[PDB]
Amino acid sequence: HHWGYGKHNGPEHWHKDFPIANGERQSPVDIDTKAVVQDPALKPLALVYGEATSRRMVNNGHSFNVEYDDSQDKAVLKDGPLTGTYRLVQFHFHWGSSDDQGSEHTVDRKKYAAELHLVHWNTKYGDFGTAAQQPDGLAVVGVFLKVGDANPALQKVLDALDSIKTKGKSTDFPNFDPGSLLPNVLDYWTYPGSLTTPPLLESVTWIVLKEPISVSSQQMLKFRTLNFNAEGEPELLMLANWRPAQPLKNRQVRGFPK
Ligand SMILES: CCCCCCCCO[C@@H]1O[C@H](CO)[C@@H](O)[C@H](O)[C@H]1O
Ligand code: NA
Ligand code: NA
Ligand SMILES: [Zn+2]
Numbered sequence: 001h002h003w004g005y006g007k008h009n010g011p012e013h014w015h016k017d018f019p020i021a022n023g024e025r026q027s028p029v030d031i032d033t034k035a036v037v038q039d040p041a042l043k044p045l046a047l048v049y050g051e052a053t054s055r056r057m058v059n060n061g062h063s064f065n066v067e068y069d070d071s072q073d074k075a076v077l078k079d080g081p082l083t084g085t086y087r088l089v090q091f092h093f094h095w096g097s098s099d100d101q102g103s104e105h106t107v108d109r110k111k112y113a114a115e116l117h118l119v120h121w122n123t124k125y126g127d128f129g130t131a132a133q134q135p136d137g138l139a140v141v142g143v144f145l146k147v148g149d150a151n152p153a154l155q156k157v158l159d160a161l162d163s164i165k166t167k168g169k170s171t172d173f174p175n176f177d178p179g180s181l182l183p184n185v186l187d188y189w190t191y192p193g194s195l196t197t198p199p200l201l202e203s204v205t206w207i208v209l210k211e212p213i214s215v216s217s218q219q220m221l222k223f224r225t226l227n228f229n230a231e232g233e234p235e236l237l238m239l240a241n242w243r244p245a246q247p248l249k250n251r252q253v254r255g256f257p258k
């Protein structure tokens with residue numbers, strides 16, 4: 001089923017083909033900081049990314065992603081709110097049509113310019129697809145991009161976008177350290193949720209970092225010159241690819257260290 005962020009096939013209509021869009025643990029959410037609860041079971045996050053091996057970058061038609069080699073046991077996410085060990089498979093971003101919107105998660109309704117999603121799958125399920133079908137199968141780390149200074153690490157990613165302008169395009173993208181896109185402080189909010197794109201599976205433990213990384217307004221321009229369409233289709237620039245906040249319903253957002 002074709003979906004996107006346009007007038008006819010956008011977040012407002014996803015429910016027609018993916019009825020879990022109106023499920024009980026949908027993402028993203030607004031994080032009401034006064035309602036955040038502390039939990040002494042929570043641990044510091046362990047993002048063990050030093051041996052993560054990037055492979056390629058791909059315009060998938062809804063955003064772009066950097067693919068990691070998840071056939072080896074090296075780049076893993078553990079601790080934080082998690083039991084067991086999750087392999088890094090890819091990262092991607094969401095952004096908006098102007099600098100003051102574009103994040104998926106919001107903090108007391110504040111939006112950032114963009115949001116990075118580092119996607120991981122629980123090693124006990126063997127692969128990404130199998131893991132995606134279990135409530136404890138995925139873990140996504142979300143990082144806010146706040147407009148300010150130019151980000152040199154981010155620039156390596158943005159430099160490659162000229163190579164992947166349209167849907168299905170890919171380029172070799174070796175040696176990129178995903179940790180170079182994390183803040184120094186790993187304080188986080190966590191809640192049980194879902195993928196923010198169809199198929200919207202409710203299999204994600206969300207880990208949203210409190211501290212953003214920076215991006216310049218000039219860098220933000222680079223995101224918005226990508227195309228949703230394939231070559232030879234009408235041009236639909238990737239001006240915005242964010243889902244609005246979804247009802248928290250009966251969930252609680254936990255915070256570490258508070
Ligand atoms: C619509 C609900 C399911 C969407 C998630 C896609 C998960 C795909 O799951 C994949 O399936 C393959 C074929 O069965 C298996 O070979 C893989 O091991 C599995 O990773
Ligand atoms: Na692959
Ligand atoms: Na290619
Ligand atoms: Zn995402």
